[PDB]
Assembly symmetry: C5
């Protein structure tokens, strides 16, 4: 017969009256475009910029009755990406792009297949820099949700309708990890249907649930700040008259709590509100601060000064034995109330 390249030029030439600027079923029912994505890459989840980049295969399927044929023998055709300007394609865009591009290395990474009844499969490769706003109030113990929504730009709801297909709407590649999160295998799929002053525009979205890993912040930040508060309680087991040994241990403990905290603020994100790790670094600073002021009272009671002089020594030995039990108890009450209120969420 004739080659498929010359048949598609016959099917969409100046003859037969095809126009790429006109949607199929024009002045009729709306075009139903069904979509699914294949995620190749996922990551660089930035938090100062509040975005993440993803690398997808965007597959679209619609019906175009002007592209139906019966004369060519084979049941499917494929159009070269150079001749792709002569197809009505949907004006899909991502409502939170924040930057995107195509891939055009060795060939345009684009695909088109026109079936015999007029079904059109259109698959392109996109790198997106999609934006998701992030809530770092409980920073190591947080769960993030980053959406991916797909609108139509120029056609309203009565002309073009997007849907997820009912067989695998979001696939993810196999060997795909993240430096700080894990990606759950549960994708919410829902409609949004944007309303502007311009009109009703269709949109569908896919949600991705991210759970931050914990093991670095425990070993590097929670456990070392825990041991410094234990070292601040060694002062209560050292006797009263060892005045360089008590304020030396008292201030070199608040210095190593300051060094532990200031050295780790470079690894933390740069939001301007209080996180959950920031409460821990500040409450553990109070337990080291309050253990020097304990000895400030003990050194002051034991110098006020006969049967009266043994009362002030007995009074200062009392508070040294109260705080020997009370500070591992008050810090335990905080250590229960901290981890319950950040694992109840």
């Amino acid at each position: 017969p004739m080659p498929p390249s010359e048949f598609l030029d016959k099917l969409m030439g100046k003859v037969s009256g095809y126009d790429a600027r006109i949607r199929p079923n024009f002045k009729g029912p709306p075009v139903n475009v069904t979509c699914n994505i294949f995620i190749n890459s996922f990551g660089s989840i930035a938090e100062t910029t509040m975005d993440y980049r993803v690398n997808i295969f965007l597959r679209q399927q619609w019906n175009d009755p002007r592209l139906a044929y019966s004369e060519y023998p084979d049941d499917s055709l494929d159009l070269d990406p150079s001749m792709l300007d002569s197809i009505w394609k949907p004006d899909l865009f991502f409502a939170n792009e924040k930057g995107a591009n195509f891939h055009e290395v060795t060939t345009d990474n684009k695909l088109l297949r026109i079936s015999k009844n007029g079904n059109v499969l259109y698959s392109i490769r996109i790198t997106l820099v999609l934006a998701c706003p992030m809530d770092l109030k409980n920073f190591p113990m947080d769960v993030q949700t980053c959406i991916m929504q797909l609108e139509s730009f120029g056609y309203t709801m009565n002309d073009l309708i997007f849907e997820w297909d009912e067989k695998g709407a979001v696939q993810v590649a196999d060997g795909l990890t993240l430096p700080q999160f894990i990606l759950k295998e549960e994708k919410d799929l829902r409609y949004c249907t944007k309303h502007y002053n311009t009109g009703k525009f269709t949109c569908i979205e896919a949600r991705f649930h991210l759970e931050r890993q914990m093991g670095y912040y425990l070993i590097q930040m929670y456990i070392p700040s825990l041991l410094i508060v234990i070292l601040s309680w060694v002062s209560f087991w050292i006797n009263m008259d060892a005045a360089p040994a008590r304020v030396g241990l008292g201030i070199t403990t608040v210095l190593t709590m300051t060094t532990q905290s200031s050295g780790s603020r470079a690894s933390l994100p740069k939001v301007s509100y209080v996180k959950a790790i920031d409460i821990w670094m500040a409450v553990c600073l109070l337990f080291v601060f309050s253990a020097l002021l304990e000895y400030a009272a003990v050194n002051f009671i034991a110098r006020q000064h006969e049967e009266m002089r043994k009362l002030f020594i007995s009074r200062a030995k009392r508070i040294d034995t109260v705080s020997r039990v009370a500070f591992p108890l008050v810090f335990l009450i905080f250590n229960i109330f901290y981890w319950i209120t950040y694992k109840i969420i």
Copy 2:
């Protein structure tokens, strides 16, 4: 009848004498273009570069009497973005762009609607990197104002006039936060009307008021530097003859004030003038510096040396009891005068 794509080619072809290089109402009254924006994204407010990036829908409406029609039945047409070079469009630009681009993924993200009386709606999607100069003199307690002004480049004031529409000139998307600021819901809308040596060019601007959040700088920088100044007053409650305990507490307190200050200068911005956080870190360094020089005098008065030797001990016990009250009082006077002069602004 005939399709709208072939009707718009008839309306703007080589026949009927349409020219896209000529404004409507040429050699007459000026073109009145009315504008409104829809902010999709807002953030990455840089302070070394002194700019911020925004993602908008720019909607423009003007009247073009050459594009009026009556023969086509429907009350509005829409032009494909491929055929968009055959429209007179206003040469709007942003007078503080510092970099900008269009969005052209899966389709040019552009929209055109030509109504029946000649009204033209033109909506495009722009990512701007707009510049706003910032005033970080009172850094945590600052309010920023970042404008967004829209000039005409080639047409002067007698040929083209920009206006904000009187129904929602700036809309903002719903789920839109910032890592360090909050965006107030009050937008000033005013004229600027640039005068050059070239002519009078129209411009309209929109102002955005940003208020910096406070909670991180209190918990990480003000409160920890506060507790170190309290620890520097423990020395006055420790007796006079404990010479390693007084200068050990005196210098390990100025070391933990240096560690607290130097570890937080990496999180602060890099301007070359004094902020309000920089005054706090330097005045709190003086209160720890001055509490060692107090003991430098006490250790010197109590060694000058009979009824004369009990005067110098009584003189050194006097100044240890004066500064035991005076340093929480002088630091309270600064702590009142600091927060009043940075909340009166």
Copy 3:
């Protein structure tokens, strides 16, 4: 005769029926494209982004029977890169691109040679930003494997087949080093043959084995943290009654362990799970933490207080002589179990 530029226009013009949109041997056996690369540059192996960039010469060879000739005398032709749109070229792409571009400085860096029997050599210069997921669980003692896979985008397995040539499939330039890794001279070459819902697409991949160098982390991080644990054992050789000398040495050792650890977390990568260097910095923090709590017991046993008072001094001298041998022994057991379990992998 005639010049080769005018002969290739005769061979592929509107006459003779050549079409660049149609593969050779159409409706027949699949096109066998044989490939090899030449790596010019290799590096910037990022770990927060989890990618690496490479600069290659991509050489492709296939047979095109429509391009066979006998009239021109010379045994090979070469086509100018301006006339390169008139060749069927394979739609190769890299399945993990994450960004790529061509080189077009002073000329398109592209090459085409059409032999007399129809063999076509096509060589282009590409800069890739290929993605490889990295496993930093055992961070200094890790071996990375970063693949480079080459699919076809639009032609399925029955139409186009990629192969590595059996003579030098991957060459690497001579003077080519890395800042943190070494590149082994062993490249695995294997098939992958992607299956989508679209079809069976050919792909071949090349694996590169990266071994991280060790010498910086020993001299800067392991050896200095080793010497601090030795300094923490000096306390057991200092006598019992030197109470400022024991807790001064005990806490300034946990402070210099905190300073050594916090100052090196800026040079470490920013994953959110525990590495092997992170276990070493935390276990060595326990050996300095536990050597103060040893003296907290010794100072407490030697103050409980006659023939009973010499028991508590003898009991506290016992544990000072046990831990004088036990802590270099328990730390040696960890130092054996650490390096065996990270050199068995």
Copy 4:
């Protein structure tokens, strides 16, 4: 009459013999192009890259006698930026570009006006990344000069001559600040006239004088290092036999001088030569270093040991009273010679 778009096509069409590849007054006197700029933005003065970026309006005026007219009534025409390829324009470039681009958002930001006698005004909007080499030998007390030179690329001195206009050659926008510098209101305007082996090419340049602000480096770096040297002199007022109090104060002062210096090297630039701030941080390290070696001598003279034993105590009390006056005097001599030699420049 006829519209100006159709008149400019008549003035520069295939008829009347206009050629955009030929300069006006060809084979005659050279074209005199007069230039002025309007600076919109100015900043991000990098010092590792040694460049700065600027955002300008470049206005050019020349005479073209082929573009003179008398038939059209109005005294000035304006050409659309789409039709701008049909004008001879000067091949101006910036001799230190290091990267530049145009602005093409909503319209090409370009302007052309052809007056009646043939005068042509051409105004474009450019973002430049101009390079200026910087001299950071006296780093806080430095004055930078960053030029902006404008050559011709292809036309030599006998064909094209650039000049600054004698009425406002450089204008600067009003609300325009810098994070670390101030921009003086004095612009030097001079010729450079490049000589190559290709020929004599015209160029004009504009110089911008930048003066670095001081207030951050005083409050954060000079004053805190000043107070640490004062704290190192407290040791001379503490008596001789307080051996933990003298070497504790002596070494925790050299530690807080090391912490102050190492914490501020991250905010300093990364040149590989000695600055003026680097001399201050090193000389102030010597004054804290030399105050421990003073006590190393005092503790050694007072232990050499009768009428001889009171000589060595009197000798060690002598040097403790010499350095009590000498170190505030020798540090004052440096503090005079430092600020004079960096304010004489």
Copy 5:
């Protein structure tokens, strides 16, 4: 006569049989292209990426006998950069580009001159991001050599030959400095002549010798670490029984050596092997480590305990007087062997 633009169209039109796809002297001797560069900018020598960027004028000269003329009177023509596609130009590229671009602001920054005998001068402006592998084994005392090689991509050695001209092959602009290196005025110029499996391709290269400046690393890193080792020797001049004064000075010296070292690893590059600055920071850590273990022995010999008790005091006073001389001697042996072995290279 006729203008030069219309004469060059006559010289290279469809008549006279010029073809830009065919080299001059085709099927004859090879084209001899002679080259020289003019360096405008040079710097941003990255070491994690291992590259440097340069801004050049690339001048090429060859002979094209088809472009010879005699009818036009003037001895040289110049072709507009718009008409530059109609010239055979050499397919030069840089064999280590790693990214490059042209400059096209206000005009393509390109130049062409066709002389009367057929000599063609072609000068373009290029920004290169050339790659040079760097050897940071002896980091402050290193000399770098970064090449710049210029191949041909498509023409082999029998068709096209590159040469440096014998009069100024590399010129450098006058006011051109570097933040960390100096550029020597000695450029090696040599051939490389790449051999591939494709053929023999010509290439010429130019080498640039970079010498790193020293003055920052001495004042900030070598001298401060030198003074800390001197402070660690003050302990030998302090007597034996001052047990808090000896281990306080001993451990606050290893802490200020850790602070000096960890604070400067952020300014050092991020290679994963040992440098020369890394040996200095580790050997100077041993001299401070070994001066506490000296006192660990002195405090242990002087407590073992009559005529026997004066032996152990005399034995411990012996080793305190040995190491008082030996540690300034052993550190002097290292300080000779260090600087000789890094200035012999």
